[PDB]
RNA sequence: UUCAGCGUUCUUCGGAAUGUCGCGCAUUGGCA
């Protein structure tokens, strides 16, 4: 029931998101701007000549990197904005250790291996340099076969329902519904 | 010895389509 609870009282963070000053603040712009970004569609943040703003360029320079090197880096610099002043930079071992012996306050991540995140980032271009610069288009590279590309969006069914009564009432309890999670996480 | 033709089959049996392509390219996307 208490979790529950706590589920009702984030549903009323929802409603009343914004405070009146807030709101406010939103509501006074001062100029409209000359251009916006082609992702974000923002034009408050300034626009580089590519019609892309800083957070969206670092995001789009990133994706490479998340794929391709394991330790991530909240550090003073870095590519994305983070919420206390510090970057998310996606480095590897070396340019991890550096950063973190060059500035004290650096939190290092460690992908599938230092807090240790775990995230699917299977490539299978990856595993050739010109199957890499390829991308997809490799993946059509077939001596027989139709060349196209099948996309797998899929949702695990009821993973709320699971969340919510996917325990029985005899067996709930703090551990269980963080091994059921972690597992599937994990998987 | 003369007088006459009469009856029965009217088409039959196979093969009835097959093989080959079954959209491609450009823009777009993707990689940089």
């Given at each position: 029931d208490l979790?529950?609870?706590?589920?009702?009282?984030?549903?009323?963070?929802?409603?009343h998101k914004y405070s009146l000053n807030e709101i406010k603040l939103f509501n006074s712009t001062i100029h409209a701007g000359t251009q916006e970004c082609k992702e974000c569609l923002r034009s408050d943040i300034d626009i580089s000549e590519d019609s892309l703003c800083k957070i969206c360029e670092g995001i789009i320079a990133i994706s490479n990197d998340l794929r391709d090197y394991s330790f991530f880096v909240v550090s003073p610099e870095g590519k994305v904005p983070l919420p206390r002043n510090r970057y998310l930079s996606v480095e590897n071992q070396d340019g991890a250790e550096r950063k973190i012996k060059m500035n004290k306050e650096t939190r290092i991540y460690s992908k599938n291996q230092v807090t240790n995140l775990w995230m699917c980032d299977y490539d299978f271009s990856t595993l050739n340099p010109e199957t890499k610069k390829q991308g997809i288009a490799?993946?059509?590279?077939?001596?027989?076969?139709?060349?196209?590309?099948?996309?797998?969006?899929?949702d695990i069914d009821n993973l709320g329902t699971t969340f919510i009564k996917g325990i029985p009432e005899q067996y709930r309890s703090i551990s269980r519904t963080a091994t059921l999670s972690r597992q599937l996480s994990m998987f």
């Open positions: 979790w529950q609870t706590v589920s009702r009282k984030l549903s009323d963070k929802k409603a490799s993946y059509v590279n077939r001596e027989v076969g139709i060349p196209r590309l099948g996309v797998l969006r899929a």
